[PDB]
Design a protein around this ligand. Structure first.
Ligand code: NFU
Ligand code: NFU
Ligand code: SF4
Ligand code: SF4
Ligand code: SF4
Ligand code: SF4
Ligand code: F3S
Ligand code: F3S
Ligand SMILES: [Mg+2]
Ligand SMILES: [Mg+2]
Lengths: 551, 268, 268, 551
């Protein structure tokens, strides 16, 4: 039984340590550890409920926007506020555009170099690389000439002997299975992605006031002043500018990102056969479109036993079934109180004891839903949508499968979605569907303004006395996010965040059940224990965010 | 042609400061990393992980001794002997003091690294402090904001590379080109402030005419920065008050994350 | 789907207002003409010339009767029976009045068409007038500036297309979203004005600190527009005052091309 | 025998009427007529010399920048001002970036539809079109996929009821000689050009304060305040932004525009054999780099009898030889005073007599140099630089010719440059060399600021009494521009502009010699006198700007 540690795990957000036991070239047991804590839950305590979102947004700047919106939703929940529909349109556009940037960056900047060897890309024939994409994609930047410009940038980087960021990576590793040509294709796409994600953030910026960290929200709605005829406010000219960037996203997402995920899968088919993190999945519905915080564009729900037939829909952020099930345990985390806590009754009292395989080993709490461990994130959200018979999701998944089929002569069944590649696929599908969310919600805003509705804000009435508890759900890039606020005598008496990477990276829980990261690693083949590329591959599929996991 | 080496260490960071680079346009991140500098260590972007990436750090620290610029984002937690941020089994405060030894220049990017920021607010659970407090005797360039416009950082690095010296700094060691003036002393809504034209509530008449946000709690009057001029994301017209929300004072110690959103600023 | 028709007629124009379209980003000129409108007549851009381009105009005037928006740039010279601007052997006034009859809406883009502009300044040798004067019974939308930011025009056309009516207009028939406020009543240098921090000459100390330009002769105090906020070219931070030169008042009748560059706003 | 009129000539700036007599299907005689006049010379009169530039910039918005810089240079000449060298770097950067936008737009938006048939492009095979460019250009946007997307846009435009801009063009006309594939290529590039020209103007905007119509000039220098450490002024961040846009220009210029020039020439070889407008050529030296208004990057001069050996260089804007030679005559134009006038003594009093074949027929004056008719513009400037043995110009021209040769197996001798296509080639060569001007001058500005020089402006001493005369020369996109100012008792007593298109589009002069447009048309074959595309082709090669020509 050989012991390895990967610390730091790079190409994630935040500070993560992964330990594995390896027996007979295969990991037999794992531990995931969040190694940095800030105490954000305590930092926002005792403040006006209206101030929380600006503070708690700083839980993470990668999934910026998410904690901000979840925080206001939680205050709105506590105070029984109906959000103006214009304010929902605005929040929705921001969330969808942000998640667009987020998924693109995760696939390319954070994940690609797990599966792609840049040194191999040097050996490629650009003409052949370009040719093998004919009839596979309509992207306009797949020319031999584009690929050569990219190849020369790599050559020159290598020539300088300053590889920097790209130095000492897993080049030449036995698990790198792409031909030189598709290595070069992917690197060219990596660079192109950076343009696409910038456009996505320009959408976020025009509504948020900037990004990272938007600044246009309020408990009660948004701070954008809608006035078609106003100077210096959200007028038609500004809305046209927003639309201009929304329109630039779809092609890269559909013709590159979507196609590259089927291509990666085609060359790594056994990764559809490992990396399962859980048999239980949860997602919240997202993108409300009425004046009552409901009518979501995306459905949510709960699946158990890896069986879509068990699908229990969740179509309301006020669903008591969802609210009552959630608890967190610090039995194996560095906090004092170890029994499972409902977040409204949660505590976060640090108790650092150092690393113990059998005791406490992480700053991440271990969440459960009615006692079960649950994977959250795009896989969970895809499975829920499939189970809900959302035609759009089936159609989009089938589009990716169809490309995989053209490439391999094989198909992908729902059973193979419980896997490292299935998880990657769920995220790509999410990103693709979000482009229609952006178009629909922009149009809805335009038409609603046309009807004469410029309302963006409902003034919160926060009573000077009495206790109020609120919970704000949000389906973030990485999974179901929830903020839990208790107000007492007009100020925050308790605040607890249960974040998607908390579900996934959580350590062993109150009954010692390992979390999704830890479960997913069991069975991972290791060619070289000094270069455990294979574990990093699986862990990256969850898109770890540790400032999120720990806060 | 050799590019200037940079070593980037993340302490208690939300990664927003690294993310700001992905919005930059002069240079873009890809041009930054392939043309402008050699980014020798960065946890978020490095191909290598674990032992391999820590090798890269050790190698770069040695090879470029006296030449690299060291960038730090996030606050530094000193309580309980540094354990609130541990990478590769060691307090981040130790990684940072080691790297600071052979640094040509040192930049604290973001309010967390510059003065403690949000992570040191309230009761300060981890005893988080800014970079200057952990590196006494060293000259720290502070580029505050949460996160700053990435060009506040990029143009600072460029000045260093192009003219061999840091840009002109104020008393708090902030580059004057970006932090030399109160936002309120260069804000386009000042005429409305002067006339008594104020938004009183989001969505009201004044708000929808683009009037001054002082009475919504704008911290412009007590916040140094370039948010009203350079603004954000290079699309034109984008900063928090332009969008309709008061400045929160995220640049300025004692303001952001200390005062309420709707709490009024002092006006000189 | 069928795109709203636009007919564009240039009178005494320098073509700057057409050129503004080439700087536009929302929509870009190519998305404008391929997706948002059908540009049925435009001399600068049209493949056809001579007899075929006049065929295009009469055909469009007939086919899209009562549906097209008519746009005019340049002033219209009334002196000596129209001879100072003659296309296809006829005075430009005549082409314009014929086109005006079937117009769904009529826009004067640029200060020349809006109020005579530079061509009507000084002794006005051609007797140049604004479009409204030529078409006295029609409601003309004025979109002044030399040239205006193209989006002042584009968002006006979009309002008509999207909502079926022109945007809200001031007493001078200018869309309020662009011209409802004095530049001075929304200028980021107003705090320097308030504090008496004035540039006295280009290159002086105050000038190089971005101080107010009033005493260089800034016409912001008497010029309505959106130059300080929308600014120009969508790159962020660019309008004349931000780059260091006083507003000349080009938007505004009796200011631009009347008053000296360095003549003060309170001086007639 | 047959008489035709083309009125309006489209795809130029301003109002131009062209008449031709046709004999045996060939034009035997032509008239060029500028049909609109404003009286800009009269409008500036009696004003402070410092006010002129803002007013006369409005002579034109296509060649914005040019009249502004020429106007300040004229006032500076009158007052013997040495322009601070930083202000020169800034003026030059603006002029070179603007001219880059100008030339690109002229080749594509103004000119291509003379040579390119959009209906034929629909019939093209996108894969064939892309394959033709293999080894011809390294541009990254020549893929079959790009060309398909472009083809579909045209298909969609035609399919709709509404061709708009493209309605009733010379589609199917016998002089359209491109194959479908090359038509498609050219239309794809027409669209891509629009992005390149936008980037060129972002450079202009960041120093000028906007475009069209920059606003950063002064008699005495510029209004940009250089201060690397200043908030809200021209600091290092702003300069870096400028550089980011400068860097974006070169690939399209070199790999697309330069290449398309040769392919057009490849399919239109006879257009190297007609369209000569003159045997005499004039250009001003341009882009001064010292603090004494000299040391020009580009040389200028005078050439007679179509013979480069006659080249008399001009290296100073205060060279009396150039100044003394220039006169204008309204013998055949609608002004009262008909004898040739030196511009310091010029008048501009309207005398409209209507059209007369033998009398007056234009608002454009007819300029001469020592009594001779002269062509100005990029062909003039190229010829002068070749004559001056400028290695950069020869090298750049040779690159274009070599592409021609790769395409045709034929060559181009200097003799063939005196033609419609030679004039086009000059313009392309000019755009290409200007990219090095941008790099050079940006770097010079950066080094000079680092030496401690932040001077941008010297205040002018303007005497309350006395007479002073100055001339400001400028090599504009369409040729040599000159503004002639007389100051008397503190104010402008005379102002005369002699503009490049005045030279080229001028009507018969005092000695009845036709101007360059008029000469160029003799010999032009006409397939259809009702659609004289062949005339429009040659005339477009001069890049007419009639608001400029007439002012
Ligand atoms: N997506 C996301 Fe965060 Ni940095 C996680 N985990 C969210 O709430
Ligand atoms: N280039 C140019 Fe203009 Ni519209 C001409 N002719 C000139 O000065
Ligand atoms: S400064 Fe703001 S953005 Fe940078 S790390 Fe601290 S919280 Fe995140
Ligand atoms: S208070 Fe804020 S919004 Fe009002 S003028 Fe000052 S900075 Fe601008
Ligand atoms: S308004 Fe200015 S830009 Fe438009 S035509 Fe008149 S002069 Fe040219
Ligand atoms: S610069 Fe012009 S507009 Fe701005 S404050 Fe001073 S005078 Fe008013
Ligand atoms: S909150 Fe921060 S980003 Fe600028 S506008 Fe205020 S300082
Ligand atoms: S001169 Fe004109 S463009 Fe704006 S800043 Fe002044 S109105
Ligand atoms: Mg928590
Ligand atoms: Mg003249």
């Amino acid at each position: 039984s050989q012991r390895i540690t990967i610390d730091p795990v790079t190409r994630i957000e935040g500070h993560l340590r992964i330990d594995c036991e390896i027996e007979n070239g295969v990991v037999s047991k794992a531990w995931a550890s969040g190694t940095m804590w800030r105490g954000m839950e305590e930092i926002v305590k005792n403040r006006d409920p209206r101030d929380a979102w600006m503070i708690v947004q700083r839980i993470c700047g990668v999934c910026t926007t998410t904690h901000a919106i979840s925080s206001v939703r939680a205050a709105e929940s506590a105070l029984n506020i109906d959000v103006p529909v214009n304010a929902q349109y605005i929040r929705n556009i921001i969330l969808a555009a942000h998640t667009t940037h987020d998924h693109i960056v995760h696939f390319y900047q954070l994940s690609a170099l797990d599966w792609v060897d840049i040194t191999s890309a040097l050996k490629a024939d650009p003409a052949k690389a370009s040719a093998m994409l004919n009839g596979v994609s309509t992207w306009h930047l797949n020319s031999a000439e584009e690929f050569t410009k990219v190849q020369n940038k790599i050559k020159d980087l290598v020539a300088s002997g300053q590889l920097g960021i790209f130095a000492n990576g897993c080049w030449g590793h036995p698990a790198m299975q792409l031909p030189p040509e598709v290595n070069l294709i992917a690197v060219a796409h990596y660079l192109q992605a950076l343009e696409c994600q910038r456009d996505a953030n320009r959408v976020v910026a025009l509504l948020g006031g900037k990004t990272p960290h938007i600044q246009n929200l309020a408990v009660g709605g948004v701070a954008n002043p809608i006035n078609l005829d106003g100077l210096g406010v959200l007028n038609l000219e500004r809305l046209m500018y927003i639309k201009s960037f929304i329109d630039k996203l779809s092609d890269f997402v559909e013709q590159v990102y979507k196609v590259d995920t089927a291509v990666i899968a085609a060359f790594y088919p056994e990764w559809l056969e490992r990396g399962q993190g859980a048999v239980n999945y949860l997602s919240a519905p997202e993108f409300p479109t009425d004046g009552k915080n409901g009518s979501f564009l995306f459905p949510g729900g709960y699946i158990t036993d890896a069986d879509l037939s068990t699908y229990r829909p969740i179509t309301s952020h006020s669903d008591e079934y969802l609210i009552k099930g959630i608890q967190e345990s610090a039995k194996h985390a560095w906090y004092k109180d170890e029994a499972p806590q409902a977040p409204w009754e949660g505590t976060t009292v640090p108790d650092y004891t150092g690393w113990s395989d059998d005791g406490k080993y992480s700053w991440v709490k271990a969440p459960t839903f009615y006692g079960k461990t649950v994977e959250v994130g795009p896989l969970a959200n895809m499975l829920c949508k499939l189970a809900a018979k959302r035609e759009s999701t089936h159609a989009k998944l089938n589009e990716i499968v169809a490309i995989y089929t053209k490439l391999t002569g094989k198909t992908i069944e729902v059973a193979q979605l419980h896997s490292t590649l299935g998880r990657i696929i769920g995220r790509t599908v999410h990103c693709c569907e979000l482009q229609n969310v952006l178009q629909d919600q922009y149009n809805a805003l335009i038409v609603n303004i046309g009807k004469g509705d410029h309302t963006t804000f409902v003034k919160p009435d926060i009573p000077a006395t009495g206790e109020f508890k609120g919970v704000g759900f949000l389906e973030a890039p990485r999974g179901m996010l929830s903020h839990w606020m208790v107000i007492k005598d007009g100020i925050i008496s308790n605040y607890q965040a249960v974040v998607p990477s908390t579900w996934n990276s959580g350590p062993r829980n109150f009954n010692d059940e390992v979390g999704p990261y830890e479960r997913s690693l069991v069975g991972t083949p290791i060619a070289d224990p000094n270069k455990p590329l294979e574990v990093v591959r699986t862990i990256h599929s969850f898109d770890p965010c540790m400032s999120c996991a720990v806060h | 042609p050799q590019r200037p080496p940079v070593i980037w260490i993340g302490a208690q960071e939300c990664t927003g400061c690294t993310e700001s680079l992905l919005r930059a346009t002069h240079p873009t991140v890809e041009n930054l990393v392939l043309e402008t500098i050699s980014l020798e260590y960065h946890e978020v972007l490095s191909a290598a992980f674990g032992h391999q990436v820590e090798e890269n750090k050790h190698n770069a620290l040695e090879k470029y001794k006296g030449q690299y610029v060291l960038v730090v984002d996030g606050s530094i937690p000193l309580k309980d002997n540094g354990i609130y941020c541990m990478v590769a089994g060691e307090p981040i405060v130790d990684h940072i003091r080691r790297a600071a030894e052979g640094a040509a220049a040192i930049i604290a990017i973001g309010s967390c690294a510059a003065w403690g920021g949000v992570a040191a607010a309230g009761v300060n659970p981890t005893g988080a402090v800014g970079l200057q407090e952990v590196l006494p005797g060293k000259t720290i360039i502070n580029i505050p904001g949460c996160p700053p416009n990435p060009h506040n950082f990029l143009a600072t690095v460029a000045h260093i590379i192009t003219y061999g010296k840091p840009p002109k700094l104020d008393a708090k060691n902030r580059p004057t080109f970006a932090y030399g003036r109160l936002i309120h002393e260069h804000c386009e809504r000042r005429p409305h402030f002067d006339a008594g034209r104020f938004a009183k509530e989001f969505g009201d008449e004044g708000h929808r005419e683009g009037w001054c946000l002082y009475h919504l709690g704008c911290k412009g009057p007590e916040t140094y920065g370039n948010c009203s001029t350079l603004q954000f994301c290079d699309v034109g017209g984008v900063w928090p008050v332009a969008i309709g929300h008061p400045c929160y004072g995220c640049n300025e110690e004692g303001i952001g994350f200390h005062k309420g959103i709707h709490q009024l600023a002092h006006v000189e």
